[PDB]
mmCIF file of C-alpha atoms in Angstrom:
data_model
loop_
_atom_site.group_PDB
_atom_site.id
_atom_site.type_symbol
_atom_site.label_atom_id
_atom_site.label_comp_id
_atom_site.label_asym_id
_atom_site.label_seq_id
_atom_site.Cartn_x
_atom_site.Cartn_y
_atom_site.Cartn_z
ATOM 1 C CA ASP A 1 101.088 106.752 77.136
ATOM 2 C CA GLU A 2 103.018 107.649 75.227
ATOM 3 C CA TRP A 3 104.784 110.120 77.556
ATOM 4 C CA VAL A 4 108.147 109.474 79.134
ATOM 5 C CA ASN A 5 107.734 110.284 82.814
ATOM 6 C CA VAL A 6 110.388 112.407 84.515
ATOM 7 C CA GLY A 7 110.151 112.998 88.249
ATOM 8 C CA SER A 8 112.013 114.723 91.077
ATOM 9 C CA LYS A 9 115.534 113.816 92.176
ATOM 10 C CA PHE A 10 115.843 110.609 94.136
ATOM 11 C CA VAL A 11 119.010 109.496 95.888
ATOM 12 C CA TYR A 12 118.580 106.151 94.084
ATOM 13 C CA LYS A 13 118.708 107.858 90.690
ATOM 14 C CA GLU A 14 121.796 109.814 91.748
ATOM 15 C CA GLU A 15 123.653 106.694 92.890
ATOM 16 C CA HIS A 16 122.659 104.342 90.076
ATOM 17 C CA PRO A 17 123.262 105.590 86.509
ATOM 18 C CA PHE A 18 120.367 105.426 84.043
ATOM 19 C CA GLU A 19 121.780 102.623 81.932
ATOM 20 C CA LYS A 20 122.202 100.276 84.884
ATOM 21 C CA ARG A 21 118.752 101.131 86.278
ATOM 22 C CA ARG A 22 117.063 100.504 82.919
ATOM 23 C CA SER A 23 118.856 97.210 82.352
ATOM 24 C CA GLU A 24 117.786 95.945 85.776
ATOM 25 C CA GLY A 25 114.214 97.236 85.397
ATOM 26 C CA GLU A 26 113.739 95.675 81.989
ATOM 27 C CA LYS A 27 114.957 92.375 83.441
ATOM 28 C CA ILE A 28 112.712 92.394 86.502
ATOM 29 C CA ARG A 29 109.613 93.294 84.416
ATOM 30 C CA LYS A 30 110.309 90.503 81.951
ATOM 31 C CA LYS A 31 110.935 88.079 84.818
ATOM 32 C CA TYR A 32 107.828 89.184 86.759
ATOM 33 C CA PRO A 33 105.277 90.763 84.414
ATOM 34 C CA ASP A 34 102.698 91.122 87.148
ATOM 35 C CA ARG A 35 104.906 92.477 89.893
ATOM 36 C CA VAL A 36 105.696 96.194 90.226
ATOM 37 C CA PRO A 37 109.269 97.362 90.943
ATOM 38 C CA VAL A 38 109.059 100.344 93.257
ATOM 39 C CA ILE A 39 111.691 102.704 94.654
ATOM 40 C CA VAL A 40 110.428 104.348 97.841
ATOM 41 C CA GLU A 41 112.216 107.336 99.453
ATOM 42 C CA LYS A 42 111.342 109.922 102.071
ATOM 43 C CA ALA A 43 110.913 113.421 100.674
ATOM 44 C CA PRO A 44 113.764 115.693 101.879
ATOM 45 C CA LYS A 45 111.414 117.978 103.845
ATOM 46 C CA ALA A 46 109.364 115.258 105.566
ATOM 47 C CA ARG A 47 109.464 115.210 109.374
ATOM 48 C CA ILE A 48 108.771 111.511 109.815
ATOM 49 C CA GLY A 49 110.985 108.446 109.968
ATOM 50 C CA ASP A 50 113.168 106.914 107.253
ATOM 51 C CA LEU A 51 112.865 103.470 105.617
ATOM 52 C CA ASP A 52 115.445 100.713 106.084
ATOM 53 C CA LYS A 53 115.129 99.555 102.483
ATOM 54 C CA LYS A 54 113.933 101.424 99.396
ATOM 55 C CA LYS A 55 113.429 98.726 96.750
ATOM 56 C CA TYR A 56 110.049 96.941 96.863
ATOM 57 C CA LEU A 57 108.749 94.347 94.375
ATOM 58 C CA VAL A 58 104.982 94.247 94.882
ATOM 59 C CA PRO A 59 101.845 92.751 93.388
ATOM 60 C CA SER A 60 100.307 94.665 90.501
ATOM 61 C CA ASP A 61 96.893 94.153 92.147
ATOM 62 C CA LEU A 62 98.056 95.537 95.501
ATOM 63 C CA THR A 63 96.155 98.752 96.219
ATOM 64 C CA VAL A 64 97.852 102.026 97.027
ATOM 65 C CA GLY A 65 95.903 102.038 100.279
ATOM 66 C CA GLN A 66 97.472 98.675 101.135
ATOM 67 C CA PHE A 67 100.946 99.952 100.283
ATOM 68 C CA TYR A 68 100.354 102.942 102.572
ATOM 69 C CA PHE A 69 99.744 100.583 105.511
ATOM 70 C CA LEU A 70 102.906 98.685 104.675
ATOM 71 C CA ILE A 71 105.135 101.759 104.584
ATOM 72 C CA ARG A 72 103.437 103.246 107.631
ATOM 73 C CA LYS A 73 104.246 100.247 109.848
ATOM 74 C CA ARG A 74 107.789 100.098 108.491
ATOM 75 C CA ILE A 75 108.512 103.733 109.513
ATOM 76 C CA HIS A 76 106.493 103.375 112.735
ATOM 77 C CA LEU A 77 104.362 106.387 111.929
ATOM 78 C CA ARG A 78 101.796 106.809 114.693
ATOM 79 C CA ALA A 79 98.333 106.085 113.303
ATOM 80 C CA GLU A 80 97.169 109.610 114.235
ATOM 81 C CA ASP A 81 99.749 111.203 111.857
ATOM 82 C CA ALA A 82 99.098 111.659 108.109
ATOM 83 C CA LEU A 83 101.130 109.950 105.346
ATOM 84 C CA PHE A 84 101.124 110.933 101.642
ATOM 85 C CA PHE A 85 102.643 109.374 98.523
ATOM 86 C CA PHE A 86 103.935 111.507 95.622
ATOM 87 C CA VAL A 87 104.664 110.000 92.237
ATOM 88 C CA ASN A 88 105.884 112.553 89.653
ATOM 89 C CA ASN A 89 105.020 115.068 92.384
ATOM 90 C CA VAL A 90 101.355 114.021 92.252
ATOM 91 C CA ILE A 91 99.360 112.312 95.067
ATOM 92 C CA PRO A 92 97.934 109.070 93.669
ATOM 93 C CA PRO A 93 94.388 107.913 94.428
ATOM 94 C CA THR A 94 94.228 105.533 97.389
ATOM 95 C CA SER A 95 91.897 103.279 95.406
ATOM 96 C CA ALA A 96 94.327 102.690 92.508
ATOM 97 C CA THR A 97 96.349 99.484 92.250
ATOM 98 C CA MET A 98 100.132 99.537 92.114
ATOM 99 C CA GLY A 99 99.758 98.127 88.591
ATOM 100 C CA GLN A 100 97.684 101.092 87.386
ATOM 101 C CA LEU A 101 99.986 103.505 89.156
ATOM 102 C CA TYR A 102 103.014 101.868 87.531
ATOM 103 C CA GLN A 103 101.437 101.978 84.071
ATOM 104 C CA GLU A 104 100.714 105.691 84.425
ATOM 105 C CA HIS A 105 103.837 106.856 86.179
ATOM 106 C CA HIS A 106 106.833 104.569 85.664
ATOM 107 C CA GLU A 107 110.076 106.158 84.454
ATOM 108 C CA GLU A 108 112.142 105.144 81.424
ATOM 109 C CA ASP A 109 114.275 102.810 83.524
ATOM 110 C CA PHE A 110 111.100 100.708 84.089
ATOM 111 C CA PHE A 111 110.984 101.668 87.792
ATOM 112 C CA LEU A 112 108.206 103.414 89.712
ATOM 113 C CA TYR A 113 109.437 106.114 92.095
ATOM 114 C CA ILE A 114 107.470 107.126 95.181
ATOM 115 C CA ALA A 115 108.405 109.848 97.656
ATOM 116 C CA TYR A 116 106.457 109.836 100.917
ATOM 117 C CA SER A 117 105.849 112.723 103.271
ATOM 118 C CA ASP A 118 103.759 114.013 106.152
ATOM 119 C CA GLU A 119 102.643 116.974 104.075
ATOM 120 C CA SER A 120 99.770 116.965 101.640
ATOM 121 C CA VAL A 121 101.344 119.454 99.234
ATOM 122 C CA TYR A 122 104.608 119.312 97.224
#
């Protein structure tokens, strides 16, 4: 708005060229206007478990707090340990919805990229 968002390197972005990512992201957003296409990767330096899958298609009214719980169970992070999301190297508010987060932070390929970590700074 009206900025193009550029974030850190993701292995997804390295392995799928921009033109293919943008074609797919434009299609999924047209097909599902109220679902958010999210790429989730572990930050390189994080000392917690990896995810099986990295592509999530979620509700735009899902809260970030709800998405935290989802990722946490999927990496089997013990409840006592902290988990943090970074989008464009910023920690989003836990009260935001995935829809608001997408609107603010999506990249030019129409995807939203989230790195997760056990550290609260990066």
